[PDB]
Every structure is written in C-alpha cells, then in structure tokens.
Symmetry: C2
C-alpha cells in the first residue's frame, strides 16, 4: 500500500483535499507530510504577523474551500483589528469579515503545481486540521507567479522558520 508520504513525493497535481479524503485524514495531515521543498509550516500564533504582511502584497485570491462550496475572491487583503475575541476586517474592496482569534493553530506556505501550473498559497488551519481559508498569489502577463509576491512570500516563510 502506497503511503501518504510516498504519494506526495510523486508530486500529485490534484487538490490536496482529495488526497486527504483518499487517506481518510485531515488537510493538515496531508500538508504536514509534503516535501519540505514545497512546504514551510508555522504555528497559528504567528497569524497577525502573517496576515498584516500579506495585506501589503497587493491583489491576492482568498478562497474558502469546503465540500459544498469553493468561494474565491480576488482583492487586496484588508487589514483588521482585534475585539471581543475576533479579528475584524475593514475592507474597502468587497472583502470583509471576522476571523476567530483562537481558531488558527497551523499556517502553511505551499509552493506546488496544480493542473500543471506553479502555485503558491498560504493556508490557515484550525485545531481539527481543516483549512479555514487559503490565500493564493496572483500571476503576471507571462502566466508566471508575480515575482514580487513570490519573493515576499518566500521571505515571510523563511523568517517564520527557526
């Protein structure tokens, strides 16, 4: 039987969600098993540092991904303030909301191919190992990932490492 670790090393290009299902485990379990060349993990405790930074990267795509609905929204990440246990967003581009402070337990910076194209995402996980939401970098006129975002993304991932 092919192990989760062996499967991920073959670099599958489908959704990690389907791999989690194939192995009857959480999305975090799958991400935690990715080759380190494709993934850098951080604790949920760095949430504010991470969010504030991405909020300076220009337009990104925030996605809510569940079995019943995948919702995607392209815009500059709004900044926010904490109050009553929630991180409240103040958006001016169509994206707003409230993120529960104690919910994020893990953060992952993933660089992998999807449908044959290079992708870079920051995934926020709750205690159950499910993705609360994901943030994907945008592309340029060459259909390549925005170089300025890739550099900031890798820089942030790096400083979150010991």
């Amino acid at each position: 039987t092919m192990t989760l670790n062996e499967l991920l090393a073959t670099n599958p290009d489908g959704t990690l969600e389907d791999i989690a299902g194939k192995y009857n485990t959480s999305l975090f379990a799958v991400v935690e098993a990715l080759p380190t060349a494709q993934c850098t993990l951080a604790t949920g405790d760095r949430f504010d540092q991470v969010w504030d930074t991405i909020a300076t990267w220009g337009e990104v795509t925030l996605i809510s991904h569940t079995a019943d609905a995948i919702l995607e929204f392209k815009s500059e990440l709004p900044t926010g303030t904490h109050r009553h246990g929630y991180f409240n967003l103040r958006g001016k581009n169509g994206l707003s909301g409230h993120i529960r402070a104690t919910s994020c337990q893990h953060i992952a910076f993933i660089e992998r191919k999807f449908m044959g194209m290079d992708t870079a995402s920051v995934v926020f996980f709750n205690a159950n190992g499910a993705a609360m939401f994901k943030i994907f970098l945008g592309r340029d006129s060459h259909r390549q990932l925005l170089s300025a975002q890739v550099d900031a993304f890798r820089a942030l991932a790096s400083e979150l490492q010991p």
Copy 2:
C-alpha cells in the same frame, strides 16, 4: 431556563450560529423553530430560481460562515452553470467559485435583527443542516436595507411559499 423555542420567541439579535451553539444543534434546527413571520422555508430544488432571481437584485453580500470565520464578499452574483457535478460561477467583480447546488436541501428567507439592525438573508443548507453559504441584502449610503431589494426579497419568499 429557556428552550430553543422560548428563546427564539423573545427575538434574540445575535447570530443564529451562537444559538445553535448553545443548544448544541445545527443552524437548520434553529431556523426551523423560527416564527413564520421571521422565516420562510423552501426546499433545495428551488436553488436555480432563487440564485437567478437574486442575481438581478444588484450588489449583495455572499457569506461563508463557520465557527472559525465569517468571510463576506460584496458583489452582484455571478452567472452559474451546472457542469461536472457543480454550479460553476463565472469571474466577475472578483467573485468566482464552485457550488454543489444539489447538496442544498433547504433554503431559508430570514428577516430578523442583528444588534438593533434589520437584516434579510437567504441561507442555503447542507443535508447536515449546516449553511453552505448565505446571501445578505445590500444597504443604502447610511446602511438601510435597500427597500428595492427588501421588496423583491419578500416577493420571492412569498412566491416560493
């Protein structure tokens, strides 16, 4: 102490999610106990009619609401196409995605208050009674429910039931 039904009768103005939490049940169970004056129910098979009707109301707020986060996307609803087991949305105003419309078993039209402020929403439910997503009506310069949408809201609800 109060039962779910007793509480709902006093017209609470917090989130229905908080109430589902207190009574450790599903959001749908809570909506089912709402007074008919505040809630109109429909089945999942009315999904297309509802989505296409709302997609002509102008800007609305599509919301993903879970125990960990409330994400709100303001825009006019994009056009949806059924294909590969999903209702796929086209890119517009920044909102896109894929919805498992068939998984929708119930649709609720709720008119209630949240923190002294009137709200009108359309909730789409899972078989498990969870909200797949919600749609809240838009508001004026100084935040009033668009009467144009409220009128169309109440009309679509009655038309369905």
